[PDB]
Amino acid sequence: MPNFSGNWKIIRSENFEELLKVLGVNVMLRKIAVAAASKYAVEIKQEGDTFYIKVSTTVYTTEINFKVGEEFEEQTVDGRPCKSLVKWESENKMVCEQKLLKGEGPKTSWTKELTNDGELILTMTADDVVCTQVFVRE
Ligand SMILES: *C/C(=C/c1ccc2cc(C#C)ccc2c1)C(=O)OC
């Protein structure tokens, strides 16, 4: 029974650098971030409403655990602790609204969707800007 469960590898990444600009990241780091983003792998274990997600590059890995509908702490795309909450939008799309623990900055959110043709699509939004990363089953 195919759901979000599996090992995914990035095949495209539109607007990553623009998003990091909105998050105040300096040019050079933006450019390295982009280079490193072509090696993004994602591992998802899913049972019902409940998700384990590991995202790794060449040199960094992180894990989140969440239940749909339950608040949890994570990091934004610019690595600040935030409050996060995930809701379904349809059978195989979910959206996440984030609010900052401490401090001021852009409105962030993200979405994961499992298309009919077997891709995983990730959007990440900072204010006006929308990054789109497409993944395929490893
Ligand atoms: C599930 C997930 C994956 C993902 C992909 C790319 C990311 C880039 C950065 C940066 C900088 C942070 C987190 C990423 C996470 C996700 O939910 O991301 C928000």
From Swiss-Prot:
GO terms for cellular component: cytoplasm; cytosol; endoplasmic reticulum; extracellular exosome; nucleoplasm; nucleus. The keyword Metal-binding does not apply. Signal peptide: none annotated. All-trans-retinoate binds at Q133, V134, F135. It comes from the Eukaryota. There is a cross-link at K102 (Glycyl lysine isopeptide (Lys-Gly) (interchain with G-Cter in SUMO)). Changing R30A: Loss of ligand-induced nuclear import. The keyword Cytoplasm applies. CDD domains: CRABP2. Pfam families: Lipocalin (PF00061). InterPro entries: Calycin, Fatty_acid-bd, ILBP, Lipocln_cytosolic_FA-bd_dom. Transports retinoic acid to the nucleus. Regulates the access of retinoic acid to the nuclear retinoic acid receptors. This is Cellular retinoic acid-binding protein 2. The lineage of its organism: Eukaryota, Metazoa, Chordata, Craniata, Vertebrata. The gene is CRABP2.
